[PDB]
């Protein structure tokens, strides 16, 4: 993609920490940018190349014809995207009405005005605060990590003039093919619109990389879920060999679309997480995620992922599983293989290399992604309700949270909770036990 400057591209700033020593963690001046797929992509003078769920064929009859003609512009962060930042905090609003309707956002955390901050968390801990008290069911405030190129994949593909500064180069473990630009190219060929999402279609190119979902949550539920791939770093896949949750053939690619997920509710403890629960979603939460390596080293093999929360002067560790026979409260090889078995779920995790392969991704730095969105594909029922709905709520793995099966319908959540928002803050990356104090 080429760059247009009808509106200047000004990143909202946000500080985070690196705890090199203990221990009074020291600041760093980051800045956040929005995924380019949320941006306006217009001709020279001056119409849209892409509208809703499709490309304009007079401007874009193919990848290069399209890419030659199309420009990516600045984002009005507060006005159109409901995105604002202050000190060490960032706010994402669900529905924003300007002169046009926007829904959610996906943001990336930079060091500079040209580079995504890479986080090397292996043998470390990543810690953050978050406010999910304003979210509700059918909504997902995700904070996660993906093996994106630090420069947005501008070096590796010459046709990408925009780079990280304009939020380019996204990938995750779904090998999404709804991205407008992938590996420099415009993703025009074989475009089909999605059957029920008006903001999305699917092209021949998908964008694959390892993804560690530290946090996918609303006030009714949460889940931490590593997704390894065969090729960890950015890779292009083609057509349905991309796999991903977004197709029928989700297990047909190089990435794990399902993950080894830990949902406190799904592992049987339904009093642990919710409004007025042990972990109170009406109050701010500190969430701690430690990545234990083979020999306690930032270059060792990843053996387990641990979860502590800090709320009201209580370091509370992750609720223990209560399902026979899935013991413990931490995602490790033992846990994941058992989890997948007792729940009759396809163990794509182990097939795509389990924790060892995730370790490889984390070893190379990863890019932090902050997002808010609703779910045309599955109505967020897999996060916060009974799933699949056909199944029995009493069968193990089925119940993920309290929400009714009738929740999560995109346009019903957009009418009921358009003003929902998530606030992430207080980001820190330092040695184990050296962030939460
Ligand atoms: C749920 O988890 C909390 C906090 O770990 C624990 O104190 C409580 O006893 C657990 N209860 C059940 C039923 O699992």
Care to describe what's here?
The protein has about 425 residues and is mainly β. It has a single domain (about 1-435), classed as Distorted Sandwich (1,4-Beta-D-Glucan Cellobiohydrolase I, Chain A). Helix content is about 10%, strand content about 30%. It is built from 6 helices and 31 strands. It has helices at about 65-70, 335-340, 350, 355-365, 380-385, 410-415; strands at about 1-5, 15-20, 25-35, 40, 50, 55, 70, 85, 90-95, 95, 100-105, 105-110, 120, 125-130, 140-145, 180, 185, 190-195, 200, 205-210, 210-220, 220-225, 235-240, 275, 280, 285-295, 300-310, 315, 330, 365-375, 420-430. It has a 16-stranded mixed sheet that branches. β10 and β11 (about 100-105) form a beta hairpin. Bound molecules: 2-acetamido-2-deoxy-beta-D-glucopyranose. 2-acetamido-2-deoxy-beta-D-glucopyranose (NAG) binds near residues 272, 278 and 322. Belongs to the glycosyl hydrolase 7 (cellulase C) family. Its EC number is 3.2.1.91. It comes from Dictyostelium discoideum. It catalyses: Hydrolysis of (1->4)-beta-D-glucosidic linkages in cellulose and cellotetraose, releasing cellobiose from the non-reducing ends of the chains. This is cellulose 1,4-beta-cellobiosidase (non-reducing end). The PDB classes it as hydrolase.
Summarize the structure.
The chain is mostly beta strands and 437 residues long.
DSSP, total strands: 31
Q: Please report the number of helical segments.
A: 6
CATH superfamily: Glycoside hydrolase, family 7, domain
| Shape field | globular
Helix content: under 10%
Helix/strand/pairing category: mainly beta
Main beta-sheet annotation: 16 strands, mixed
The fold-level CATH name is 1,4-Beta-D-Glucan Cellobiohydrolase I, Chain A
> Any idea what the CATH architecture is?
Distorted Sandwich
CATH class: Mainly Beta
Total discrete domains: 1
| Small ligands present | 2-acetamido-2-deoxy-beta-D-glucopyranose
| Distance from first to last alpha carbon | 44 Å
Radius of gyration: 20 Å
Please state roughly what percent of the residues sit in beta strands, choosing from under 5%, 5-15%, 15-25%, 25-35%, 35-45% or over 45%: 25-35%
């Amino acid at each position: 993609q080429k760059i247009g400057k009808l509106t200047p591209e000004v990143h909202p700033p946000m500080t985070f920490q690196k705890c090199s020593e203990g221990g009074s963690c020291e600041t760093i001046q980051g800045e956040v940018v929005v995924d380019a797929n949320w941006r306006w992509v217009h001709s020279a003078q001056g119409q849209n190349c892409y509208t809703g769920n499709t490309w304009n064929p007079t401007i874009c009859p193919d990848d290069e014809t399209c890419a030659e003609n199309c420009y990516l512009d600045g984002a009005n962060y507060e006005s159109v995207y409901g995105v604002t930042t202050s000190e060490d905090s960032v706010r994402l609003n669900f529905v924003t009405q300007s002169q046009g309707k926007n829904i959610g956002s996906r943001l990336f955390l930079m060091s500079n005005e040209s580079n995504y901050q890479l986080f090397h968390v292996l043998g470390q801990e990543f810690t953050f605060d978050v406010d999910v008290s304003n979210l509700d069911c059918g909504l997902n405030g995700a904070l996660y990590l993906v093996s994106m190129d630090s420069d947005g994949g501008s070096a590796r593909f010459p046709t990408n003039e925009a780079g990280a500064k304009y939020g380019t180069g996204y990938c995750d473990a779904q090998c999404p093919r709804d991205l407008k630009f992938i590996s420099g190219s415009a993703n025009v060929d074989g475009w089909i619109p999605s059957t029920n999402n008006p903001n999305t279609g699917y092209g021949n190119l998908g964008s694959c990389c390892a993804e560690m979902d530290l946090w996918e949550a609303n006030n009714m539920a949460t889940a931490v879920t590593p997704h390894p791939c065969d090729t960890s770093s950015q890779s292009v896949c083609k057509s349905d060999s991309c796999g991903g949750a977004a197709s029928s053939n989700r297990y047909g690619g190089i990435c794990d679309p399902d993950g080894c997920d830990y949902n406190p509710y799904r592992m049987g403890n339904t009093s642990f997480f919710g409004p007025n629960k042990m972990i109170d979603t009406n109050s701010v939460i500190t969430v701690v995620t430690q990545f234990i390596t083979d020999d306690g080293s930032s270059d060792g093999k990843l053996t387990s992922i641990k979860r502590l929360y800090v709320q009201d002067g209580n370091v509370i560790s992750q609720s223990v599983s209560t399902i026979d026979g899935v013991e413990g409260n931490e995602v490790n090889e033992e846990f994941c293989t058992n989890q997948k078995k007792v729940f009759g779920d396809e163990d794509s995790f182990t097939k795509h290399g389990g924790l060892a392969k995730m370790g490889e991704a984390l070893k190379d730095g990863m890019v932090l992604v902050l997002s808010l969105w609703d779910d045309y594909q599955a109505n967020m029922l897999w996060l916060d309700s009974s799933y699949p709905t056909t199944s029995s709520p009493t069968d193990p793995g089925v119940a993920r949270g309290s929400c009714p099966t009738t929740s999560g319908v995109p346009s019903k959540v957009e009418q009921n909770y358009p003003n929902a928002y998530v606030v992430y803050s207080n980001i820190k990356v330092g040695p184990i036990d050296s962030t939460y104090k």
